[PDB]
Amino acid sequence: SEISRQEFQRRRQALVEQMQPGSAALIFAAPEVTRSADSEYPYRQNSDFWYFTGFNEPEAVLVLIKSDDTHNHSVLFNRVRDLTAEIWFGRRLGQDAAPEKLGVDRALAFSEINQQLYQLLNGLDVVYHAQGEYAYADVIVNSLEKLRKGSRQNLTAPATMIDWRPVVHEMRLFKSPEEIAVLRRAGEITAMAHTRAMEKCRPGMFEYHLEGEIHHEFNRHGARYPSYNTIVGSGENGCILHYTENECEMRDGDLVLIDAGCEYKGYAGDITRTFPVNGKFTQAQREIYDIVLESLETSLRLYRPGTSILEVTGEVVRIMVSGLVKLGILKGDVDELIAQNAHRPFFMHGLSHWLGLDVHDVGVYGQDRSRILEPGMVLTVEPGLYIAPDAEVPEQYRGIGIRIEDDIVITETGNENLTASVVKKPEEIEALMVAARKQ
Amino acid sequence: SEISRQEFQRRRQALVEQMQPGSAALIFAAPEVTRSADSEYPYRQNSDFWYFTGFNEPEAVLVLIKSDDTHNHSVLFNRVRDLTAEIWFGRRLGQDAAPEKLGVDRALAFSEINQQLYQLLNGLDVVYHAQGEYAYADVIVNSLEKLRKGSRQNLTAPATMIDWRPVVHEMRLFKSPEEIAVLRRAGEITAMAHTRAMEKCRPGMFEYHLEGEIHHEFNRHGARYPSYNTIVGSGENGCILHYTENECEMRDGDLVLIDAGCEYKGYAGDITRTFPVNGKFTQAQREIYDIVLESLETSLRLYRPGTSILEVTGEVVRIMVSGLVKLGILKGDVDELIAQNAHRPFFMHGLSHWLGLDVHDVGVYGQDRSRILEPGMVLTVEPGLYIAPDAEVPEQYRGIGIRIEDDIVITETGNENLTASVVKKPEEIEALMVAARKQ
Amino acid sequence: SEISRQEFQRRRQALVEQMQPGSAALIFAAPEVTRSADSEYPYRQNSDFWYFTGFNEPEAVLVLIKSDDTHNHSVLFNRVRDLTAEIWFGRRLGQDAAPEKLGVDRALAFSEINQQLYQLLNGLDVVYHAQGEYAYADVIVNSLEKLRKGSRQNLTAPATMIDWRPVVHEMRLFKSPEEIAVLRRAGEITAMAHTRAMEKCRPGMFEYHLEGEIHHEFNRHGARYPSYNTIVGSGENGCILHYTENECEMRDGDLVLIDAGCEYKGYAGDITRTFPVNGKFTQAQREIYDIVLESLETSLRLYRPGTSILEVTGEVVRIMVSGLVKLGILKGDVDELIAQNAHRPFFMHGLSHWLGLDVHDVGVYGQDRSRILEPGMVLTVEPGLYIAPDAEVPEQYRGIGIRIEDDIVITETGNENLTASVVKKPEEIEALMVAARKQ
Amino acid sequence: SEISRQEFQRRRQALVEQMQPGSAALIFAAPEVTRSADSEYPYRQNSDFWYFTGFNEPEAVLVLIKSDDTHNHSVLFNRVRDLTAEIWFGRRLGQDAAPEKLGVDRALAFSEINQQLYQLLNGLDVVYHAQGEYAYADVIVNSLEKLRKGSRQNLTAPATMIDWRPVVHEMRLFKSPEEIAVLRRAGEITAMAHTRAMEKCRPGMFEYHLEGEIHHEFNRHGARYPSYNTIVGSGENGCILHYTENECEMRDGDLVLIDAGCEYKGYAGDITRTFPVNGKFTQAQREIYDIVLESLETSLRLYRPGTSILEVTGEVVRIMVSGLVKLGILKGDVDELIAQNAHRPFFMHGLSHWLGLDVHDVGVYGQDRSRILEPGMVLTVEPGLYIAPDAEVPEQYRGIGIRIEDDIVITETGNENLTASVVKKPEEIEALMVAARKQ
Ligand SMILES: [Mn+2]
Ligand SMILES: [Mn+2]
Ligand SMILES: [Mn+2]
Ligand SMILES: [Mn+2]
Ligand SMILES: [Mn+2]
Ligand SMILES: [Mn+2]
Ligand SMILES: [Mn+2]
Ligand SMILES: [Mn+2]
C-alpha cells in the first residue's frame, strides 16, 4: 500500500482551500546531512514536504500560490538535470518531467530560486512559511528584503507571514484511509521483525544481533530504514528508555526490552516487546510483566472516540499503583499513593503519543494530553515499569525494565490494533520461544 | 581487534611532540544530527576526535596543553553525569570516571566550557584549531575575544592559530600495526558480506534485498553500520557510480554492481564486486569484465613502496584502451587514443583513494595523486568500465557498468590485499553462484 | 516646539486601535554604533521607536499588548539603573521612573528580555514585528521558538507575524499639527544656517568652512546634529549630488551648491541653495539658475491636495527642456525631446521626496510617485540642473551644478513653504552677499 | 602637517620586514555605517587600515604578500570607477590611479575579491589576519575554505593564521617625528577650542552651546570631526565621566567640565579643562581644583623615559589623599588611607592612556599600566576629583566634578606637553574669563 500522486494533490488543494486569497505557501525540502567528512547519511525528506509531494530529493521548494478564491497554481523548484552529477550521484527528476510526475503546474531550477521567488511573492498579502525550521530556508525567504526595498521597481512585499505548521499538523493528525493502510502495513512489518527477534534470541548473543535480525526483516518487506534508532536493552539496560548502545551480551536469566519500528513509505511502525532471554520469565519478572500487560490490555479496551490519553492514563496509574502495592514495591493506601503520583519513579513517561510520518507525530495534545480522541487519529499505547537496579524495593525486582507497546488507530467505535500480530501474553511469548529453541 | 586506550594516548603524545611549547590543541566532537523532527541519526563521532580518544559522546572537547618542552597535560570537557538524561537517553561517562577511562589528566563539564576555555588559552602563544569544521566549535573558540579584550584583567590571547589537520591527517595516513589489524578485520567482514550477496542473489529480488543481506552480515560480526551508503546497481544502474536508490527488481540477464563496506571500530571496509544476476556472464558482459579484472590484477602486482597511484593508473589506462579497441568500443591507434584520454567516457573516476577512519581517507595525494607510496598507507584499487545505455558503441555493450574494488595495505615489499577472500575471477564467481543456486 | 508625552501615547493608542485582539506589537531601539575601536558615534534612536516613545536610550523594547478590543497595556524593557555604568557613561531612566516618564504601564530590565518576552507572547494570535530591521531584534523575537517547543509547559506561539511598518509609516506620512510646528522650526533653523553660509562665503575659504558655519548655527538653536551629511560642492563638485568631501578651496568665479539640514526633535530640515562664491552670478551661471528657479517657483504654485509629485514633475520637465533648448544645451523639438526624456543627463533625480523623522521619509509614493497628495504630507521640492564638465554643450555651461530645494507641507488649499525665509531669487542672493561683503 | 605617501609605504615595508617569507597580511577597511534608515554616519576609516594607506574609502582590502626574504608586493582591492555611483555619492579612486596614488603595486576591483583572494593565498604558509574585527572581513577570509577543499585543483591553504594587531599596535605605540607633528597640531587646535569655550561661557547658556563653539573651532582649522563625543558637564554633570547629553542650562555658581578633542589627519587631540561658569571659582571649588592641578603639574614634571604610568599614579594618589584629608573629605592617616585606596570614590579612573589614531590608543600597558615609558610614546595626563552630590563629605564639596587633562609626548629627557597653550592655573582661567566678560 502507498500514497499516490492524486492524494498528494488533494492535500495540496486542502491547504490552498484554507489559505487566504492573494497568498503563497512555501514548503522546503530537508537539507542533505553529513555523517563524516564527505560522506552523508541516507537522505530523509522533511515530513511536511513529503506529505505534500512524495518527492525524495533535496534542494527543492514547493510553492503554492492562491491568486484568489478560484485561481491557484503550484511551482516546484528542484535540481536541474545534470549529466555528470547524475553519473556520479544518481538520477534527478529535473524540470521537464516534474509537472506530470508530481502533479505540479510548473517546475523551475533550484539554482534560480533567488531570482524567481521574490517575483512569485510580489504583491501577495500573505506568505505562509515555517520559520526557524531550516536555516537555509529562512535565508531564502528573508532575501522579502528585495520586495521591501524594491518600491522604485514597483515591488511590494506581503506584510503578513503565517506559520503553516499548526494547520498542516492538524491535517497530519487525521489519517486518510490510504494512510491507515500504509500504517497498517508498517505495523505488520514491525510485528514480524519483533516475532523474528523473539525466535532468534538466545543467551550469549549480543543485543545488536537482535537489531540486525530486526533491520533485515524490515528490509525484506521494503522498509529499508527504521523509523527511529533501535533499542535492545537487556537486564539493567531495559531501565534506560532509549538505550541504543545495544553492546552487551545477553544474559541467561535477564529480560530483554526491544523498542523498534520500521519506516514504510514515510510512516512509522513503533513496537516494544519485553521477554526473557532464555525463553522463560522468572516469578519476579512475571509479576512486573503482568502489571504492564494489564495496563496495556485495559487501555486497548478503553481507547475510543470520546475519551482521551489523559483519561486512559488515570486507569493505567491505578492498575500500576495497585500492583506495586500488592508486590511490596509501594507502601500505603492506593488512593493516597495515586494522589502523590507514587508510580512516577517506575513509570516516568507518557502512555501514548501520536504516530505518523514521524514516530512522535505532530498534532496538538491538549493540556496534559487531554484532547478528546476522534476517528482517524493514530497513536501508541506503551505502559512500562522500570525498577532501577538500586531502587529501595524487594531485591528480586531490581534491574527490571519492562515496556509493552502497540500502535492503534481510533475508529468509529473503538480502535483497531495495528500490531497485535506479535504476541504479548507471557504464556504466548514463552510458547513462541520454546518452539523456536527446539528448532 | 581494536585500538586500545594506550594507543590513543600515544597519538596524543605524538601530536604534543610536534606542537610548539606554550600552546594548546583543541579537538571537538561531532554534533548530534537530526534525521526528522525530534529523531536523530545514529551518532557518528568526528574521525579526528575519535582518532585521539575512542570516545563516542557528543558535546566533548579534547584540550592538549603543551606548557613547555617537558610539561604537557590533557583536559576533557564532556557531558556531566545526569540521572534523568541518562534514564531517558543513555549512560554518560561524566567527569569522575573520564581521566582513568580515557587516559586524560582532567575532565570538566561541557556546560562550563565558556568559563574555562579562555582560562586554559590565557598566555599561550599558539592555539591549534581546525577552523571551519564545525560552526559550534568556531563559536566557542572565537569567544579568544575574552582574552583579547581582557588586558585589564591581565589576560592575553595567543596571536597564532594553526590548523592541526595537515599534521593529524599525515599521522592518519600511516597506519600502526594495530590499525592495520582492525582494517584487516573490516576487509574480511566486508568480503563475507559480498560473498553472501553473491550467494543470495536471484533474478526477481530487489536491489535493496542484497543491501539487507550485506548489512545483516556486517552486523553479526560487530560492525553495526556501513562505512558509506550501500550501492546495489543492477543493469543500467551500474553505470551510476554511487547509485544508492537500490529500488529496482533485478533482471535475469543483467549484471549487478555491489559497492558496500562496513565500519568496524571506526575503520572503513570498501569493496565492490560486479556479477551476473543469474549466475552466468554473457559473452558481452564477460568481455568488459575481463578488461576491468586485468586492470585490477595488474595493479595488485604493481602497488608497492616507490611507485604511485598516478604511475599505476597509466598501466590501467593502457590495459583499458587496448581492450576497448579490441572490442570495437574505441577506434584508432592505442597510443594516440591514450594521449587523448579516450578511456574517460568509460572510466571517469580515480583508480584509488586512501582508506581509514573515513572511506575517502585524509592525507595528501600529491598533484595528480603522484605522491610516492610508502609502507603503512592503506588504499583501494577500483578500476571500472561503464558503458552508457546510449553510448555510440556496439549494441551489446550498452548499459554495462562494472567495477571491481579491493582494499590494500602497502608493505615493505609490495602490498597485502585485505579483501581477496571474496572471489573476483569470473569462473570463480559463476562457480560460487552455481553452487548456491542448487542450494 | 516639540512632541510631548501625550502625543506619544496617542500614537501608541492609534496603533493598538489598528491591531487585532489577542496580539502584541514589538518596537526595538537602535543599537549603539562603533565609530572606531571603543568609541561610538553619537546615539541616534530608531525613527519608529522614537515616534512612539521619545526615548533616547539603546537596549530598549516597546511592547504593546492588545488582549482584546477593550483591554490593552504597554511594557517597556530598558536598561536597569546602574551606579558605576552611570558614573562613567551617563544617567539611565531605569524601571521605577519609566512608567510615569514615558507613559507606559510597566517597565522591565532589558537584561530580562529573554526570560519575559516569550511569556508576554504566550497564547497571543499575532505578533507585529519589523523583521530584518535589526539582527539583534530578530534574534530576540525568534527565540517564539521557546513557545513553539513548549507545549508540555502549556505554551503556544502566535502563528501570525505582521510587519507593522506599512501601517506605522502611513501614520508617519501624515503629520499632526504639533509635528508640523516642529518641522516648521527645523525649516527655519536650517534657513538661518543657509543665510549665514551665504553671508560668510568668500573666495579662498574651504568648502568645509561653510559646513562649520552651518553646523554652528544648527547647534545654537538646539539642533545638535545635521539630519544628513552636509554637502558643500563648489565648481565641478556641484555636479555630484551628494558630494560630502567638502575639501576644496572655493574659487572666485565658481558657484557653490550647499545641501544641509538640521535634525530638531528628531525631524529633518532639508534645504539646498546654490550661489556664486564671489557674490555675483556670471551670465552663464545666471542662465541655468533661472531654469532651476522657475522649476521651483512653478512647483510651489502647483503643489496642493489633488495633484501628485508625478504630475508636478511633468511641469518641471517642460520648463527644463524649454530652457535647455533655448540656451543651446538641447537640440530639437521640445515635445519630441520631452518624449525621449532628454532632460535626464542634466536632471537625474526626483523632484520630491517625503520629509519627517528621516530626511527621505517613509510612506508609499505610488508608482512613479503618482499618489494623490493630501493635507498633512510634508515633502521637499528640489529641481536641479547639472552640466558635467565634459558635457557636449556650449563651453560656458560645463561644470555647472545647481539645485534649489525647499521643504513644504500640503495644506487644505495649497502648501505652506517652511524654508522660504532664506532667499533664492538671484538678485536677492547677490543683494544679500553684497551687503555681507561690505561688512 | 600630515603623513605622506612615503611614510605609509615605510610602514608597509616595516610590517613586511617582520612577516615570515611565504605569507600575506590582510588589512580591511571599515564598513560604512547606518545612522537612520538610508542615511549613514560620516565615514570613519579603520585606524589600522588608515595607518597603512591614508585611503578613506570603504570596501577596500590591503594585501601585503611576502613571497620570500627579498621579494614582496602589494595588492589593493577597492571600489571600481562607476559613473552613476560617483555622480550620486562621490568620486572613487578606482583601479587605474590606485598604484601611483597610494604606492601599491596592483589594484583590483573589490567586486572580484572572492575570485582573487584565494588565488593570492594559494600555497602561502601564513596569513596574517585580524580575526573578529569585522564580520564581513571574516566571511571573505574564511571563504581559505576554497583552498582547503581545492586539492584536486592543486590548491593549498596556509595552515597558520597570525593576528597582526599585536605587532601593528606596537608599531602605532611609537610615533614617528611626522606623527608627533600631526599630534602637536591636533593638540594646538584642541587647545584653541577650549580657550574659545572659556571665553564664550556665560551663565544661562546651554552646555551644548560650548560644544557648538568647540566644533566650529575644530572645523575652521581643518579638523572636521571630534575624535570622541564632546563632554560639557556643568554642576552635577561634571561627576559623570563621559556625560555627553550636554542639555542643561549652565548655572551661575557652578563649574563646567569640558572634555573635547579634535581628529586631525586621523589623530586625536584629548583635552579637559574645568572652570567656573561665572568666571570666578568659589572657595570650595578652588580647594578641589588645587588638588587636581598639583596632581597634573607633578605628573608633568615626572613623566619621562624610565618611569611608568603606575609609578606616576602613586605620586598623584598621595597628593589626592593628602589634600582630601586636609579638606576634611577623608579621615585618618594618609599612609593608611593610601593603603586602602581611599581616594577611589573620588578618583575612579586611570591617570593616563595612550593617544594616537584612536583617543584610547592601542599598545600594551603592562600589568597595572607598569610598562616602562620610552621616547615616542604619546599619552594623556588627566587626574580628576569627583565629589558625588550625595557624598558623605562637607556640604560645600558635593556636586563638584573636576578633571584637568593634557596630552604629552615622552622625549629623550622628559616629555613635551602638546596642549599647554590653553590655561589651567585658576588665576589664569579667571583672568582669561574676566577679560572676555568685559568684551
Ligand atoms: Mn517505542
Ligand atoms: Mn512510542
Ligand atoms: Mn567502493
Ligand atoms: Mn572506493
Ligand atoms: Mn537636500
Ligand atoms: Mn531632499
Ligand atoms: Mn578626555
Ligand atoms: Mn583621555
What distance in Å separates the CA atoms of residue D404 and residue A386, rounded to the nearest whole number?
A: 75
Question: Are D259 and D240 within 8 A, CB to CB?
Answer: no
From the CA of A358, which ligand is nearest?
2
Cβ of D41 within 8 Å of Cβ of C41? The answer is yes
Q: Which residues of D touch C350 (CB under 8 A)?
A: none
SS3 A165: helix
**Residue B209 appears among annotated catalytic residues:** no
The CA-atom distances, in angstroms, between B37 and each of A176, A356, A362, C376 are 22, 12, 9, 52
Cell of A294: 494489564
What's the reported resolution, in angstroms, to a tenth? 2.3
Q: Is residue A93 located within the same domain as residue A177?
A: no
**CB-count burial class (<10 Å; 0-12, 13-18, 19+) for D338:** middle
Spatial CB neighbours of C229, under 8 Å, sequence gap ≥ 6: C242, C244, D39, D40, D42
Name the DSSP class of D373.
Answer: P
Name the DSSP class of D116.
Answer: H
Q: Is residue A200 located within the same domain as residue A151?
A: no
What distance in Å separates the CA atoms of residue C333 and residue C326, rounded to the nearest whole number?
A: 11
**CB-count burial class (<10 Å; 0-12, 13-18, 19+) for B369:** buried
Spatial CB neighbours of B112, under 8 Å, sequence gap ≥ 6: B77
For C216, the closest of D38, D46, D216 (CB atoms) is D216
Question: Are A146 and A335 within 8 A, CB to CB?
Answer: no
The DSSP annotation for C275-324 comes to EETTS---HHHHHHHHHHHHHHHHHHHH-STT--HHHHHHHHHHHHHHHH
Q: At what angle do helices A426-437 and A177-200 cross, to 10 degrees?
A: 60
Spatial CB neighbours of A101, under 8 Å, sequence gap ≥ 6: A5, A93
For residue C311, the tally of other CB atoms under 10 A from its CB is 15
Q: Is residue C179 located within the same domain as residue C260?
A: yes
Angle value at C-alpha D63, between D58 and D66, nearest 5 degrees: 165
The CA-atom distances, in angstroms, between C387 and each of C207, C243, C289, C395, D387 are 20, 15, 12, 10, 62
How many CA atoms lie within 13 Å of A212's alpha carbon, on the beta-carbon side? 22
Find the B353 Cα to ligand 4 centroid distance in Å: 6
Question: Are D189 and D195 within 8 A, CB to CB?
Answer: no
How many CA atoms lie within 13 Å of A53's alpha carbon, on the beta-carbon side? 31
What distance in Å separates the CA atoms of residue B147 and residue B155, rounded to the nearest whole number?
A: 5
* CATH code for the domain in which residue A210 is found: 3.90.230.10
Q: Is residue D90 located within the same domain as residue D123?
A: yes
For residue C342, the tally of other CB atoms under 10 A from its CB is 20
Q: Which residues of B touch D151 (CB under 8 A)?
A: 364-365
Q: Which residues of A touch B2 (CB under 8 A)?
A: none
Q: Which residues of C touch A144 (CB under 8 A)?
A: 131-132
What distance in Å separates the CA atoms of residue D375 and residue D177, rounded to the nearest whole number?
A: 11
Q: Is residue B131 located within the same domain as residue B5?
A: yes
Cell of C106: 510597566
Cell of D391: 557624598
What distance in Å separates the CA atoms of residue C145 and residue C160, rounded to the nearest whole number?
A: 14
Question: Are B204 and B230 within 8 A, CB to CB?
Answer: no
Minimal C-alpha gap between C109 and chain D (Å): 22
What distance in Å separates the CA atoms of residue C427 and residue A140, rounded to the nearest whole number?
A: 58
Q: Identify residue C380 by its one-letter amino acid code.
A: T
What distance in Å separates the CA atoms of residue B86 and residue A239, rounded to the nearest whole number?
A: 10
Residue bearing cell 581509514 = B356
Spatial CB neighbours of A319, under 8 Å, sequence gap ≥ 6: A291, A294, A295, A298
Q: Identify residue B150 by its one-letter amino acid code.
A: G
Q: Identify residue B57 by its one-letter amino acid code.
A: E
Q: Is residue A224 located within the same domain as residue A362?
A: yes
SS3 D35: strand
Question: Are D373 and D312 within 8 A, CB to CB?
Answer: no
SS3 A438: coil
The CA-atom distances, in angstroms, between D35 and each of B149, B248, C182, D38, D326 are 26, 62, 21, 8, 50
What's CA C196's distance to the chain center, in Å? 22
Strand ranges in B277-428 using DSSP code E only, listed in sequence order: 378-381, 384-387, 400-403, 406-411, 414-417
What distance in Å separates the CA atoms of residue C108 and residue C96, rounded to the nearest whole number?
A: 9
* CATH code for the domain in which residue A142 is found: 3.40.350.10
Cell of B261: 563496506
Name the DSSP class of B110.
Answer: G
What distance in Å separates the CA atoms of residue C279 and residue A261, rounded to the nearest whole number?
A: 91
Query: Last residue of a domain, which of A143, A172, A201?
Result: A172
The H or E element spanning position C268 is strand C267-268
Query: Last residue of a domain, which of C143, C172, C201?
Result: C172
Cell of D243: 556625560
Q: Residue A399: phi, psi to the nearest 5? A: 85, 15
Q: Identify residue B154 by its one-letter amino acid code.
A: N
Closest listed residue to residue A207, CA positions, set A163, A243, A166:
A243
Angle value at C-alpha C301, between C296 and C304, nearest 5 degrees: 110
Q: Which residue of A has its CA nearest to C350?
A: A152
Q: b/e string for A123-155 if b means 16 or more Cβ within 10 A?
A: ebebbbbbbebbeebbebbeebebbbeeeeeeb
Minimal C-alpha gap between D70 and chain B (Å): 24
What distance in Å separates the CA atoms of residue D351 and residue D314, rounded to the nearest whole number?
A: 10
The H or E element spanning position A406 is strand A406-411
**CB-count burial class (<10 Å; 0-12, 13-18, 19+) for C323:** buried
Q: Is residue B396 located within the same domain as residue B407?
A: yes
Q: What is Dmax (Cα atoms) for chain D? A: 83
Spatial CB neighbours of D334, under 8 Å, sequence gap ≥ 6: D318, D321, D322, D325
Q: Is residue C90 located within the same domain as residue C203?
A: no
Closest listed residue to residue C8, CA positions, set C77, C62, C59, C58:
C62
Which residues of B are documented as binding site for Mn(2+)? 259, 270, 353, 382, 405
SS3 A7: helix
Minimal C-alpha gap between B168 and chain D (Å): 12
Which residues, in sequence order, are bridge partners of residue D108? D77
**CB-count burial class (<10 Å; 0-12, 13-18, 19+) for D66:** buried
Q: Identify residue A326 by its one-letter amino acid code.
A: K
The CA-atom distances, in angstroms, between A178 and each of A7, A173, A267 are 9, 14, 12
Question: Are D246 and D232 within 8 A, CB to CB?
Answer: yes
What distance in Å separates the CA atoms of residue A346 and residue D171, rounded to the nearest whole number?
A: 69
Q: Which residues of B touch D131 (CB under 8 A)?
A: 142, 144, 161
For B358, the closest of A39, A219, A360 (CB atoms) is A39
Spatial CB neighbours of B78, under 8 Å, sequence gap ≥ 6: B55, B57, B59, B60, B92, B93, B94, B95, B98, B107, B109, B110
Spatial strand order of the sheet with A406-411 comes to: A378-381, A406-411, A414-417
**CB-count burial class (<10 Å; 0-12, 13-18, 19+) for B333:** exposed
Question: Are C41 and D228 within 8 A, CB to CB?
Answer: no
**CB-count burial class (<10 Å; 0-12, 13-18, 19+) for A429:** buried
Q: Residue A83: phi, psi to the nearest 5? A: -60, -45
What distance in Å separates the CA atoms of residue D340 and residue A418, rounded to the nearest whole number?
A: 80
Q: Is residue C68 located within the same domain as residue C33?
A: yes
The CA-atom distances, in angstroms, between B154 and each of A430, B140, D347, D369 are 71, 21, 22, 10
Cell of C73: 497595556
Which residues are within 5 Å of ligand 8 (an ion), measured at CB?
D 270, 380, 382
- How many domains does the structure of chain B reveal? 2
For D159, the closest of B151, B162, B364 (CB atoms) is B162
- Give the pairing type, strands B126-129 and B255-260: unpaired
Name the DSSP class of D354.
Answer: B
Name the DSSP class of C206.
Answer: B
- Give the pairing type, strands C61-66 and C23-28: antiparallel
What distance in Å separates the CA atoms of residue D384 and residue D401, rounded to the nearest whole number?
A: 8
From the CA of B381, which ligand is nearest?
4
Q: Residue B242: phi, psi to the nearest 5? A: -115, 50
The CA-atom distances, in angstroms, between C289 and each of C261, C297, C323 are 21, 12, 10
Cell of A251: 544474559
Q: At what angle do helices D426-437 and D283-302 cross, to 10 degrees?
A: 120
Instruction: Tell me which method was used to determine the 3D structure.
Output: X-ray
Q: Is residue D201 located within the same domain as residue D242?
A: yes
Question: Are D209 and C219 within 8 A, CB to CB?
Answer: yes
Question: Are A293 and A404 within 8 A, CB to CB?
Answer: yes
What distance in Å separates the CA atoms of residue C241 and residue A365, rounded to the nearest whole number?
A: 62
What distance in Å separates the CA atoms of residue C390 and residue C398, rounded to the nearest whole number?
A: 6
Cβ of B37 within 8 Å of Cβ of A362? The answer is yes
Catalytic residue ranges of A: 38, 242, 259, 270, 349, 353, 360, 382, 386, 403, 405
Task: Round the CA-based radius of gyration of chain B to a whole number and report it.
Answer: 25
**Residue B349 appears among annotated catalytic residues:** yes
**Breaks in chain B listed by the residue before each, with C–N > 2.5 Å:** 143
Closest listed residue to residue B259, CA positions, set B228, B282, B286:
B228
The four Cα atoms C92, C97, C101, C106 give a dihedral, to 10 degrees, of 110
Q: Is residue D266 located within the same domain as residue D385?
A: yes
Domain that holds residue A130: 1-172
Long-range contacts of C311-316 (CB under 8 A, 24+ apart): C311/C370, C312/C351, C312/C352, C313/C350, C313/C351, C313/C369, C316/C347, C316/C351, C316/C383
**Residue D242 appears among annotated catalytic residues:** yes
What distance in Å separates the CA atoms of residue A202 and residue A206, rounded to the nearest whole number?
A: 9
Q: Residue C260: phi, psi to the nearest 5? A: -155, 145
Q: At what angle do helices B165-173 and B5-18 cross, to 10 degrees?
A: 130
Spatial CB neighbours of B212, under 8 Å, sequence gap ≥ 6: A215, A216, A219, A220, A224
What distance in Å separates the CA atoms of residue D84 and residue D100, rounded to the nearest whole number?
A: 25
Query: According to the annotation, is C179 in a ligand binding site?
Result: no
Cβ of D240 within 8 Å of Cβ of C206? The answer is no
What's CA D259's distance to the chain center, in Å? 13
Closest listed residue to residue C216, CA positions, set C278, C262, C275, C279:
C262
Residue bearing cell 569493496 = B271
Angle value at C-alpha B225, between B220 and B231, nearest 5 degrees: 105
Minimal C-alpha gap between A370 and chain C (Å): 12
Q: Is residue C353 located within the same domain as residue C248?
A: yes
Query: Last residue of a domain, which of C172, C203, C223?
Result: C172
The CA-atom distances, in angstroms, between A56 and each of A31, A36, A78, B36, C192 are 11, 22, 11, 14, 70
Cell of C279: 557674490
Name the DSSP class of A425.
Answer: S
**CB-count burial class (<10 Å; 0-12, 13-18, 19+) for A61:** buried
**Residue B360 appears among annotated catalytic residues:** yes
Q: b/e string for A246-261 if b means 16 or more Cβ within 10 A?
A: bebebeeebbbbbbbb
SS3 A371: coil
What are the helix (H) ranges across B253-375?
283-302, 309-327, 334-339
